[model samples]
Target: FNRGGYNFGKSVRHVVDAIGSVAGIRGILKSIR
Candidate 1:
């Protein structure tokens, strides 16, 4: 994070996780039938 780097997949994966978090929870909640 606070270091010199080239390609950063960690940062991209972090975004991917955040993107799924809301949809994962909301999708399950919406399925409470």
Candidate 2:
């Protein structure tokens, strides 16, 4: 499984939302294959 999220920043100093890998890349590739 994979999860993703994003946020828009108003300015360079603005804090933007960040997200990380929730699932393994290999698992996703296997599923696609």
Candidate 3:
């Protein structure tokens, strides 16, 4: 089904969508700066 990544790929239409989709990833990535 590829539910998580696959669903994320399709649903994320913008940067905010991408970040909001993976909220944990958003925290680490933003903290990297």
TM-scores for all predictions:
0.34, 0.22, 0.24
All candidates' lDDT scores?
0.72, 0.39, 0.64
What local lDDT does model 3 show for residue 29?
73
Q: Flag the better candidate by TM-score, 1 or 2.
A: 1
List clash counts for every candidate, in order: 0, 0, 0
lDDT of 1 by residue, 1-33 (tens): 663555488677776897888687767778974
Name the 10 consecutive residues with the lowest summed lDDT in model 2. 13-22
Best candidate, lDDT: 1
Tens digits of lDDT, candidate 3, 1-33: 555555665555665666676776757879886
Once fitted onto the true fold, the runs of candidate 3 whose alpha carbons sit more than 4 angstroms away are 1-21
Q: What TM-score does prediction 2 earn?
A: 0.22
What is the lDDT for 29 in model 2?
Answer: 63
lDDT of 3: 0.64
Model 1: weakest 10-residue lDDT segment is 1-10
